[PDB]
């Protein structure tokens, strides 16, 4: 985790939280804090990258999260302007593009000759009022392959995690998706797509088709809430999503969606931990397994 420009107090909490979740047994926190000098801040992601390269070079995999390159940008600006190097758009040096592009190009998934080893990366960019047209955002958007775009309205509307599906895209996407989860999430994509379009129809007499969409859409959105700082295993993501896909959650009340999730999971843990183990180990769900899964969901849905 590359904490860029963040106050030492904030990073102390981060460290403490990591310790609480006992995650220091794989985490490294490269820290260039607010106090730390703007040259240190400038070279900080580059420095961080080298740590990652060692893992990648060892053929291992790792994930480096640059948070946030926006403050790195400002620091480079400070250096450049002070070194009297020519200013540029939004008073950022012209080769800020070159620097950022170089940084994000040190992340890679290597060839098996080289070891196959990877350095997964996930840069975080802070948008100043969602101004994606802003010079540092626009540049980064071009360099990156994919974006996930968090949306303030959703956050306020208590949808945590607040991810606006419309403005989140992955262009690597399903190539790197668990096969089981891929099977059970084509439907999910289509349902949500309709829900977005049929969103404004929420404001008198509504078509039965739209109302079906609305029930499915609202329940799905509710399903996609997750209480932050509690992650959830994929082998427990798939049963819940299967239910939603089969629209078995449509009947369940919004208030009971939350209750449904934990209860269904507990039901699976007692009743069908064969299924859970199968999901976990097989990673692919055969027609028979998806069959069995439907049965289990129905039974739980009845209670």
């Amino acid at each position: 985790y590359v904490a860029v420009g963040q106050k030492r107090s904030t990073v102390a909490q981060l460290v403490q939280t990591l310790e609480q979740h006992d995650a220091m047994k794989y985490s490294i926190i490269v820290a260039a804090t607010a106090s730390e000098a703007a040259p240190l801040q400038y070279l900080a992601p580059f420095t961080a990258a080298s740590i990652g390269e060692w893992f990648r070079d060892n053929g291992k995999h790792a994930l480096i999260v640059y948070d946030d390159l926006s403050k790195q940008a400002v620091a480079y600006r400070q250096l450049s302007l002070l070194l009297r190097r020519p200013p540029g758009r939004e008073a950022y040096p012209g080769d800020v593009f070159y620097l950022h592009s170089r940084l994000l190009e040190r992340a890679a998934k290597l060839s098996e000759k080289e070891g196959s080893g990877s350095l997964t990366a996930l840069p975080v960019i802070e948008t100043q009022g969602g101004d994606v047209s802003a010079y540092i955002p626009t540049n980064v958007i071009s360099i990156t392959d994919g974006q996930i775009f968090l949306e303030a309205e959703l956050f306020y509307k208590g949808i945590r995690p607040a991810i606006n599906v419309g403005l989140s895209v992955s262009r690597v996407g399903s190539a790197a998706q668990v096969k089981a989860l891929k099977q059970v999430a084509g439907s999910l994509k289509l349902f949500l797509a309709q829900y977005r379009e049929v969103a404004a129809f929420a404001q008198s007499d509504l078509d039965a088709s739209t109302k079906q969409t609305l029930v499915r859409g609202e329940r799905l959105t509710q399903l996609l809430k997750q209480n932050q700082y509690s992650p959830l295993a994929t082998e427990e993501q798939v049963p819940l999503i299967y239910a939603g896909v089969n629209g078995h959650l449509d009947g369940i009340e919004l208030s009971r969606i939350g209750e449904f999730e934990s209860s269904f999971l507990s039901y699976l843990k007692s009743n069908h931990n064969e299924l859970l183990t199968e999901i976990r180990e097989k990673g692919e769900l055969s027609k028979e397994l998806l069959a069995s899964l439907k049965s289990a969901t129905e039974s739980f849905v009845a209670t």
């Binding site: 758009r89 008073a91 404001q203 008198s204």
Partner: protein, 265 residues
């Protein structure tokens, strides 16, 4: 500043576009039900008209008018107002019964002494026989409608699904029914005051149909209006978008110029 005031205004325009779009769709939804009712009603009316035709009937004055409380459904309100004024040339002063707020207001302005009866007006739901019946019943009792030898009702006939023509018809008095020439080919009673019964029955039967026709014309108009609104809103989106884009460029240029000016020193 320019950019932000443009942008907020453009967002407003966007929201307006969205609302007018949404409204247009919901209007269509309502319109289907409206049309369905009007057929069945019109068929029933036609059966009564069969008598009046075959009878060869044909009739102060009364004016009854029909609008909904709801606005934003074209020029129904004022085309009807225009046609009321036209039939208030025919007889200058008349007793105005206004069924519905939209005609009530416009008409109230044009003739204020003429307004004698008014109705809060039929609600969201399309007109129903029960409602028509009570309005008719009060029309007979309160206004003594038959006393006025002219009775005329105004409503909006939904001429085509893209048009509405405000239309009127004359309600045939019981006196008329008596003296109808082919009255003699409709006979079986004289100990039943069939004119006095049939008059009352067709006071309502005609009125319900007129109301149903009107309500449908209103919902149709609303669809039309909300569609045209969407088009107008689109035009503003495009015009203010061009301004937005230009304004965006201008900010970049002005800001850049400031940096350059500083650099030059």
């Amino acid at each position: 500043a320019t950019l932000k005031e443009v942008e907020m205004r453009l967002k407003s325009i966007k929201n307006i576009e969205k609302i007018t779009k949404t409204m247009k769709i919901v209007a269509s939804t309502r319109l289907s039900k409206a049309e369905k009712a009007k057929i069945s009603a019109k068929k029933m009316d036609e059966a009564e008209q069969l008598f009046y035709k075959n009878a060869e009937t044909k009739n102060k004055e009364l004016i009854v008018a029909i609008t909904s409380d709801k606005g934003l459904c074209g020029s129904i309100h004022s085309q009807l107002a225009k046609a009321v004024r036209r039939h208030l040339n025919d007889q200058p002063n008349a007793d105005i019964v206004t069924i519905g707020d939209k005609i009530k207001m416009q008409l109230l302005r044009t003739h204020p002494n003429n307004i004698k009866l008014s109705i809060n007006g039929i609600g969201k739901d399309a007109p129903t026989f029960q409602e028509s019946a009570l309005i008719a019943d009060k029309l007979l009792s309160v206004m003594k409608a038959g006393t006025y030898p002219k009775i005329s009702i105004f409503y909006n006939d939904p001429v085509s699904s893209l048009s509405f023509e405000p239309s009127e018809k004359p309600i045939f008095n019981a006196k008329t029914i008596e003296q109808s020439p082919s009255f003699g080919k409709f006979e079986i009673d004289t100990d039943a005051n069939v004119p006095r019964d049939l008059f009352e029955y067709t006071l309502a039967n005609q009125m319900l149909t007129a109301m149903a026709q009107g309500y449908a014309a209103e919902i149709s108009a609303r669809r039309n209006a909300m569609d045209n609104a969407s088009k107008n809103a689109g035009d503003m989106i495009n015009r203010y978008s061009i301004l937005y884009n230009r304004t965006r460029q201008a900010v970049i240029t002005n800001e850049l110029v400031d940096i350059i000016t500083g650099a030059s020193s």
